[PDB]
C-alpha cells in the first residue's frame, strides 16, 4: 500500500517535501543527545525492508557521527562507527541493521534497528531467534552487518579474489608451506 | 602448562572422559539392515552382502574384487525412445539374489492399509440438508445461496455427495 | 622464496592417515544413519565447459527441472528419494536432456521405494 509510495519518495531526497522534512528533523536531532532512543522509525519503508517489526523486542536508536577524514582516511565507514557506539550503549541488545536518515555539514545521522534476544516474543519467533544464538554477540564489532559485509569485500567474482572468504585467511593460506609425508 | 602442573601436585581426581562419539558407527534397531550388519565389515562389504549400492557417484579409487557396492520418428524427437501433463506427486509408480535384498523387496511390496478420511458431522448435515431440498440437481444446489453459503461449484458438491454416499 | 617468516607457517601432514580413518568413520556414521539408503545422492552427467575439456564429461550438481519432469519424477519428491536438484542449470540442447533423462529412468528402474508407514 503506502510503503511503495514512501520508497519512491525516499528516492527523491532533494525534492521540496523531502528537503523541507530533512532540514526540520536535522535541527531537532542536532539539539538532542548523540545516541538517543527513537520511539518509531522516521523511515518506516526503509526499516521494514531491513527487518524492523512493530513488536516488543525491537528498538530504534538514532546516532550522529562526525563526518570527514581521520590525509589518512579512516578505512572504517561512518555507518559502522554509528552501530558500534549504539551497540555499547545497548550492550544487552543485538544490532540487526542500520540506515541513513539525515546528514548535516558536520554530522551524518543514522538509525540502528536493534533486537532484544532475551524477550520471549523474539525467542519464540523462528524468523528472528537465530540472533538469540551466542555466535551473534556484537555483530557490528566483527564486520557482520551490511556495512561490515561491504567493507570486507565479501562479494563473488574475479574483482574480489583476495577478500571474498576473508583477507587474512586467504593471506595465511597463500603463505603456508605445505609439506606432505611423501615428497 | 601451569594448570597441568597444578593438577599433577593436586589431590583432586583426574576426570576421565568416556569415549562418547556424537554419531554411531553401526546401524541399530529391529529393522532388516540392523540384524544383518557385520560390525567387523566395512560399508562396501556390508552393502555387497546386502545386494545394495553404497555410493552412487563415480569410482574414486581401485576396489577390491567383488566390490558390487561402489557403482518410426516422424518428428525428430530424442525423447520418444525414452518413453514407456500431470504426474503423481507423493509417490512413484515403479512396476539367486541376496537374502537382504529379497527381504527389503518383500517388506516394501507388502500390502498396507489406507486410513480413509471420513467426514465431519456438520459436513454430513450440510450435504444431507442439501439433498433434502433438491435431490439430485447439483446445479440448483450450487445456485442456492441459503443452503450453500460458501458458493461452492456443483462439481465440488457432487464429489462431496459421492464421498458421503448420497449421490 | 623464503623472504617472509615461513617458519611460523609450515604445515606438516603427519595426520594424513588419521584423517583418512576419520573420513572413513564419518562415512560409516552416514551409513549407520541412512541404513538401506546410499550415502551419496544421484547427480547428473554434465559436459566440461572449456574447449580443452569439451570432449569429456563429469558429474554435475543436480538435475534440471525439465529433466525431472521428462523422467516422470516430481520436483518436490526428488530430494527426498536421493536425487539432487539444481535450479540454476539449463539444458540448452536436446542431447544433455536425453542423457540425464536416461540416467534418471535407469535410477528409477533400480530403486526400492518404501511406503511412509
Amino acid at each position: 500500500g503506502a510503503l511503495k509510495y514512501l520508497e519512491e519518495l525516499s528516492k527523491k531526497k532533494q525534492s521540496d517535501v523531502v528537503r523541507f522534512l530533512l532540514r526540520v528533523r536535522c535541527w531537532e536531532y542536532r539539539q538532542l543527545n548523540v545516541i538517543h532512543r527513537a520511539s518509531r522509525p522516521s523511515r518506516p519503508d526503509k526499516a521494514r525492508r531491513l527487518g524492523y517489526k512493530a513488536k516488543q523486542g525491537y528498538v530504534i536508536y538514532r546516532v550522529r557521527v562526525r563526518r570527514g577524514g581521520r590525509q589518512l582516511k579512516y578505512q572504517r565507514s561512518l555507518r559502522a562507527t554509528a552501530e558500534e557506539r549504539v551497540g555499547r550503549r545497548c550492550s544487552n541488545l543485538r544490532v540487526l541493521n542500520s540506515y541513513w536518515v539525515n546528514q548535516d555539514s558536520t554530522y551524518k545521522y543514522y538509525e540502528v534497528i536493534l533486537v532484544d534476544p532475551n524477550h520471549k516474543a523474539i525467542r519464540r519467533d523462528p524468523r528472528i531467534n537465530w540472533i538469540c544464538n551466542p555466535v551473534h554477540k556484537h555483530r557490528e564489532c566483527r564486520g557482520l552487518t551490511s556495512t561490515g559485509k561491504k567493507s570486507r569485500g565479501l562479494n563473488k567474482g574475479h574483482r574480489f579474489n583476495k577478500t571474498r572468504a576473508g583477507r587474512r585467511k586467504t593471506w595465511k593460506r597463500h603463505n603456508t608451506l605445505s609439506l606432505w609425508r611423501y615428497r | 602448562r601451569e594448570l597441568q602442573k597444578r593438577k599433577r601436585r593436586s589431590s583432586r581426581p583426574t576426570i576421565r572422559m568416556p569415549n562418547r562419539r556424537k554419531k554411531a558407527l553401526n546401524p541399530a534397531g529391529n529393522n532388516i539392515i540392523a540384524k544383518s550388519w557385520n560390525k567387523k565389515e566395512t560399508l562396501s562389504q556390508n552393502y555387497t552382502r546386502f545386494g545394495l549400492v553404497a555410493k552412487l557417484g563415480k569410482a574414486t579409487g581401485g576396489t577390491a574384487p567383488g566390490n558390487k557396492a561402489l557403482l518410426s520418428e516422424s518428428d525428430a524427437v530424442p525423447q520418444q525412445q525414452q518413453q514407456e501433463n500431470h504426474i503423481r506427486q507423493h509417490d512413484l509408480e515403479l512396476e539367486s539374489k541376496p537374502e537382504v535384498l529379497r527381504a527389503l523387496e518383500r517388506e516394501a511390496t507388502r500390502p498396507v492399509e489406507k486410513t480413509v478420511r471420513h467426514q465431519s458431522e456438520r459436513e454430513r448435515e450440510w450435504l444431507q440438508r442439501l439433498v433434502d431440498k433438491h435431490g439430485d440437481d447439483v446445479a440448483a444446489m450450487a445456485r442456492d445461496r441459503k443452503l450453500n453459503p460458501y458458493q461452492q461449484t456443483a462439481s465440488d458438491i457432487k464429489r462431496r455427495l459421492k464421498k458421503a454416499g448420497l449421490l | 622464496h623464503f623472504r617472509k617468516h615461513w617458519q611460523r607457517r609450515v604445515r606438516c601432514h603427519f595426520d594424513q592417515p588419521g584423517k583418512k580413518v576419520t573420513r572413513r568413520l564419518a562415512r560409516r556414521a552416514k551409513a549407520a544413519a541412512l541404513a538401506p539408503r546410499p550415502v551419496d545422492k544421484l547427480r547428473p552427467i554434465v559436459r566440461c565447459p572449456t574447449v580443452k575439456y569439451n570432449r569429456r564429461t563429469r558429474l554435475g550438481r543436480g538435475f534440471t527441472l525439465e529433466e525431472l519432469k521428462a523422467a516422470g519424477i516430481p520436483r518436490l519428491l526428488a530430494p527426498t528419494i536421493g536425487i539432487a536438484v539444481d535450479h540454476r542449470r539449463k539444458n540448452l540442447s536436446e542431447e544433455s536432456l536425453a542423457a540425464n533423462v536416461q540416467r534418471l529412468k535407469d535410477y528409477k528402474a533400480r530403486l526400492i521405494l518404501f511406503p511412509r508407514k
Partner: peptide, 21 residues
C-alpha cells in the same frame, strides 16, 4: 518451526529407499 516448513515436512518427508546392485 514456521507453518510453511511444517506443511512441507508433513507432506514431503524424507523417504526410505534402497538402490539395488
Amino acid at each position: 518451526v514456521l507453518e510453511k516448513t511444517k506443511k512441507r515436512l508433513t507432506h514431503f518427508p524424507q523417504r526410505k529407499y534402497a538402490v539395488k546392485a
